[PDB]
């Protein structure tokens, strides 16, 4: 039962807000929070690939339902989960947030927050657990 997971997400979001300098106000595990902080950060300082026919294929309005988010993300794991796709999933969630704020849609970002949780838990936590849980996440990226 993971509120454990809710939590990753918020941090990670807050953490990717603050860095691109907006506010985060609409808000062994500390190792993980960070391992993924620099996981995500690195993924983008390298990739840049965002998100984008995802953020574009998503053109998020407050009209947007979880469903349609969900599909767009499914696009990341249309060859199954792995860590790096996991990582991109957040990085992507990060990216939405900011657009929302740039859109002057700032109310959305706690929604994005939840969607990521649901998705996380519903779709991703399975394979996470099956490959030794956020721990392996740490010796990897750790």
UniProtKB/Swiss-Prot annotation:
Family according to the record: Belongs to the Bcl-2 family.
Post-translational modification: Proteolytically cleaved by caspases during apoptosis. The cleaved protein, lacking the BH4 motif, has pro-apoptotic activity.
Span(s) of short sequence motif BH1: 75-94
Entry comment describing in which tissues the protein is expressed: Widely expressed, with highest levels in the brain, thymus, bone marrow, and kidney. Bcl-X(L) and Bcl-X(delta-TM) expression is enhanced in B- and T-lymphocytes that have been activated.
Compartment(s) where it occurs, according to its Swiss-Prot or TrEMBL record: Mitochondrion membrane; Nucleus membrane; Cytoplasm, Cytoskeleton, Microtubule organizing center, Centrosome
Function: Potent inhibitor of cell death. Inhibits activation of caspases. Appears to regulate cell death by blocking the voltage-dependent anion channel (VDAC) by binding to it and preventing the release of the caspase activator, CYC1, from the mitochondrial membrane. Also acts as a regulator of G2 checkpoint and progression to cytokinesis during mitosis. Isoform Bcl-X(L) also regulates presynaptic plasticity, including neurotransmitter release and recovery, number of axonal mitochondria as well as size and number of synaptic vesicle clusters. During synaptic stimulation, increases ATP availability from mitochondria through regulation of mitochondrial membrane ATP synthase F(1)F(0) activity and regulates endocytic vesicle retrieval in hippocampal neurons through association with DMN1L and stimulation of its GTPase activity in synaptic vesicles.
Species classification: Eukaryota, Metazoa, Chordata, Craniata, Vertebrata
Membrane topology, record value: Single-pass membrane protein
A GO BP entry: negative regulation of reproductive process
Principal subcellular localisation of the protein: mitochondrion
Protein name: Bcl-2-like protein 1
Origin species: Mus musculus (Mouse)
Motif BH3 per record, residues: 32-46
Residue positions of motif BH2: 126-141
Complex and partners: Homodimer. Interacts with BAD. Interacts with PGAM5. Interacts with HEBP2. Interacts with p53/TP53 and BBC3; interaction with BBC3 disrupts the interaction with p53/TP53. Interacts with ATP5F1A and ATP5F1B; the interactions mediate the association of isoform Bcl-X(L) with the mitochondrial membrane ATP synthase F(1)F(0) ATP synthase. Interacts with VDAC1. Interacts with BCL2L11 (via BH3). Interacts with RNF183. Interacts with GIMAP3/IAN4 and GIMAP5/IAN5. Interacts with GIMAP5 and HSPA8/HSC70; the interaction between HSPA8 and BCL2L1 is impaired in the absence of GIMAP5.
Keywords: Apoptosis, Cytoplasm, Cytoplasmic vesicle, Cytoskeleton, Membrane, Mitochondrion, Mitochondrion inner membrane, Mitochondrion outer membrane, Nucleus, Phosphoprotein, Synapse, Transmembrane, Transmembrane helix, Ubl conjugation
GO CC annotation terms, alphabetical: Bcl-2 family protein complex; centrosome; cytosol; endoplasmic reticulum; membrane; mitochondrial inner membrane; mitochondrial matrix; mitochondrial membrane
Top-level division of the source organism's lineage: Eukaryota
Full protein segment contained here: 1 to 196 of 233
GO molecular function: BH3 domain binding; identical protein binding; protein kinase binding
Entry's free-text remark on domains: The BH4 motif is required for anti-apoptotic activity. The BH1 and BH2 motifs are required for both heterodimerization with other Bcl-2 family members and for repression of cell death.
Short sequence motif BH4: positions: 4-24
């Amino acid at each position: 039962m993971s509120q454990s997971n809710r939590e990753l997400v918020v941090d990670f979001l807050s953490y990717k807000l603050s860095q691109k300098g907006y506010s985060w106000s609409q808000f062994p595990m500390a190792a993980v929070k960070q391992a993924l902080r620099e996981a995500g950060d690195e993924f983008e300082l390298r990739y840049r690939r965002a998100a984008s026919d995802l953020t574009s294929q998503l053109h998020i309005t407050p009209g947007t339902a979880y469903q349609s988010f969900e599909q767009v993300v499914n696009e990341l794991f249309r060859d199954g989960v792995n860590w790096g796709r996991i990582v991109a999933f957040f990085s992507f969630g990060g990216a939405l947030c900011v657009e929302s704020v740039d859109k002057e849609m700032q109310v959305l970002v706690s929604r994005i927050a939840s969607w990521m949780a649901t998705y996380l838990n519903d779709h991703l936590e399975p394979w996470i657990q099956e490959n030794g849980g956020w721990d392996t996440f740490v010796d990897l990226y750790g």
